[PDB]
Ligand SMILES: [Ca+2]
């Protein structure tokens with residue numbers, strides 16, 4: 001469950017948040033494959049509640065109605081078509097598995113669901129599964145409200161309803177079996193693994209029993225004995241009875257401390273500075289590198305109300321964001337996930353973005369297709385951070401330097417830092433309020449290297465800045481603090 005199962009030499013996954021299956025299938029072929037992306041995390045592919053107030057929020061996808069593969073992203077045929085086409089070009093699909101719960105307990109009964117299945121929350125009835133009252137934790141939960149009220153009590157966090165979400169009785173084999181059934185369908189179609197939603201709200205043991213029933217990955221694309229890559233969503237910044245480490249037995253775990261600290265550092269808040277990143281990783285209290293799923297931001301916290309709060313960097317803060325994402329992708333700690341977002345009408349009323357619920361670009365509820373501009377950015381209010389040159393090139397940087405050690409670290413005691421990855425890559429950052437002009441040991445073979453932040457290597461030349469590494473591995477870097485992208489990166493495959 002720890003192996004990503006990506007093609008050899010692909011090291012990142014991208015979250016194509018709320019994208020339609022047909023758009024992801026094309027993206028695999030036209031972009032993710034040739035640019036070296038390892039795979040895609042998709043939004044939950046199972047039927048969910050169609051929430052009409054507010055109008056089709058992003059959060060309705062976290063309220064299952066059944067396990068039919070039928071959502072605004074598309075139907076089962078389109079899902080299968082996407083998984084096949086992506087696998088056929090060496091790009092994996094990872095499914096967002098929402099298995100802790102069904103929908104909100106106060107949602108109205110009816111067929112307001114993305115595949116038209118009937119369900120009745122009040123009576124605990126989901127016949128398209130089917131699940132009935134006996135399949136929920138109503139009788140196990142000990143709080144007066146039936147909901148989670150106190151995070152200091154690990155059992156209620158597991159047995160009670162998260163904000164009213166009907167809590168499945170994962171201790172039961174029948175329930176374990178229906179979820180496994182769904183996950184196996186996905187596995188056999190060709191899925192490489194799963195993001196396990198709301199893992200904190202489930203006993204590590206129940207997750208185990210569910211995973212125990214899973215098939216090996218599809219033997220047309222994956223070697224014999226292959227197991228689904230598992231990464232569990234647990235937000236753990238310390239101070240609670242539940243710990244990320246409680247889930248290591250099942251797979252990787254999201255390391256939410258990662259983006260929270262990095263965002264603090266790059267913004268230079270709370271006394272933090274880049275030179276402190278020299279012992280980035282376990283040195284900062286993070287979980288072991290081999291269990292961490294890292295990211296600068298995710299679909300929840302980019303809206304500003306995750307544990308990292310306001311310190312989380314996003315596409316809205318593009319300049320600092322690119323740098324944070326670049327630092328992440330260059331650094332060997334963890335397995336990296338890059339965010340890909342859509343724009344929404346962000347509106348703050350004293351502290352909250354009252355539009356943080358807004359779903360993807362849409363025409364009356366129908367998700368818009370992703371259009372590609374001539375310069376390869378996206379239209380239809382899809383941000384496509386993964387297509388920004390500065391990020392896309394760093395995705396390749398990580399592939400190029402895979403397995404090389406963190407080395408040749410430099411810092412000026414403030415916010416000018418640099419480091420290498422063995423003899424295959426080197427990156428330099430200026431986050432101080434004056435220019436960074438200095439000759440540095442890069443660890444690389446002598447030559448002329450294209451900076452892949454400023455530009456690209458194409459046909460024996462560079463479209464951007466050129467860095468000259470001499471016989472002793474040293475190179476001069478000059479980065480003005482007024483640079484729009486105040487960082488440079490070069491690697492073995494950007495050498496002329
Ligand atoms: Ca639960």
Ligand SMILES: [Cl-]
Nearest residue numbers: 195233254298
């Ligand atoms: Cl996540």
